[PDB]
Design a protein around this ligand. Structure first.
Ligand code: SF4
Ligand code: FES
Length: 312
């Protein structure tokens, strides 16, 4: 009844202090993740290249057949370690291009020069959503294979830093025409991935496929979260990889079990057809916008607080 995980977000550090895990503990987590069935491993955190053992960690992903994605800013010593990371079998690179930046270009040019698939990532909001054409030209200029533009904080999970920062319905309708025209314009050259607030949807989307249903986030100290923003929710018992095997955390840790399945649900989700399709929406949005994480996501039209959130 409990599904196998597919992705793993490894926050290796918060650097750009001394409480970070040892190399051997990360190598164990990667091994246990492959044993559970994880496919993708996102090497990130603050700056994953700041780790001295970043090459050995990347090599273990290749040794275990895990698809490694280096989520990095591309600044500082990131370019120095790129050649070694390529040699050990780094599968993919994701450069957050939010726009000093000259050295991001040198890192990006070297990634494509080695033949690695590059993905520019950028966070868009009401202020900088007019910059989407500039991001499209940059991705083509650098020769990236993919371009991500998302109003959410972390791609995959549906959570925002603030509500007033979100873009207009007019801006979303505008950013569809820009992205769709550029998709046809660059069918084979670039892949464009847009994530924006759905102002026409009556029902919400499953956040990361559902709580405790796909992804794991592992903090630098070894704390395992069902999502990046899960520490927002109070009363959750997170387990550490230093005290349990990853499989026991995925299946038995109270933080993962808390909002997994449908037994936790309040109305209207508890008596709803779509309860096992979107899983009540996003827990963190519910908490951040209603005060209780077990509430229905206000993004849903059946939420009683949808009338207030829509006016905001
Ligand atoms: S009510 Fe709960 S389950 Fe039914 S749609 Fe709205 S969110 Fe998804
Ligand atoms: S971000 Fe949607 S569940 Fe935590």
């Amino acid at each position: 009844v409990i599904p196998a995980p597919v992705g793993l977000l490894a926050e290796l550090t918060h650097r750009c202090r001394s409480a970070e895990l040892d190399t051997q503990t990360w190598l164990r987590v990667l091994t246990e993740a492959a044993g559970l069935g994880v496919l993708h491993v996102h090497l990130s955190g603050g700056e994953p290249t700041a780790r001295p053992d970043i090459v050995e960690i990347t090599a273990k992903c290749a040794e275990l057949g895990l698809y490694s994605n280096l989520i990095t800013s591309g600044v500082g010593g990131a370019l120095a370690k790129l050649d070694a990371l390529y040699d050990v079998g780094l599968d993919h690179v994701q450069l957050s291009v939010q726009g000093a930046q000259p050295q991001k270009m040198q890192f990006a040019a070297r990634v494509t020069e080695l033949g690695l698939p590059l993905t520019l990532n950028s966070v868009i909001h009401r202020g900088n959503i007019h910059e989407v054409p500039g991001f499209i030209d940059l991705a083509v200029k650098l020769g990236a294979k993919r371009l991500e533009v998302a109003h959410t904080q972390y791609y995959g999970w549906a959570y925002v830093n603030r509500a007033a920062l979100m873009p207009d319905k007019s801006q979303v309708d505008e950013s569809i025409r820009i992205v769709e025209a550029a998709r046809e314009r660059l069918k084979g050259q670039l892949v464009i991935d847009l994530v924006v607030p759905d102002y026409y949807a009556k029902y919400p989307k499953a956040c990361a496929g559902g709580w405790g249903r796909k992804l794991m986030n592992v903090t630098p100290q070894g704390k395992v979260l069902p999502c990046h923003a899960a520490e927002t929710i109070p009363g959750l018992e997170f387990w550490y990889v230093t005290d349990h095997a990853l499989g026991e955390i995925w299946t038995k840790s109270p933080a993962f079990a808390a909002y997994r399945g449908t037994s936790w649900m309040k109305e209207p989700c508890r008596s709803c057809d779509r309860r096992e399709k979107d899983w009540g929406g996003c827990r963190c949005q519910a908490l951040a916008l209603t005060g209780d994480a077990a509430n229905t996501d206000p993004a849903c039209s059946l939420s009683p607080l949808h009338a207030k959130m829509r006016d905001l």
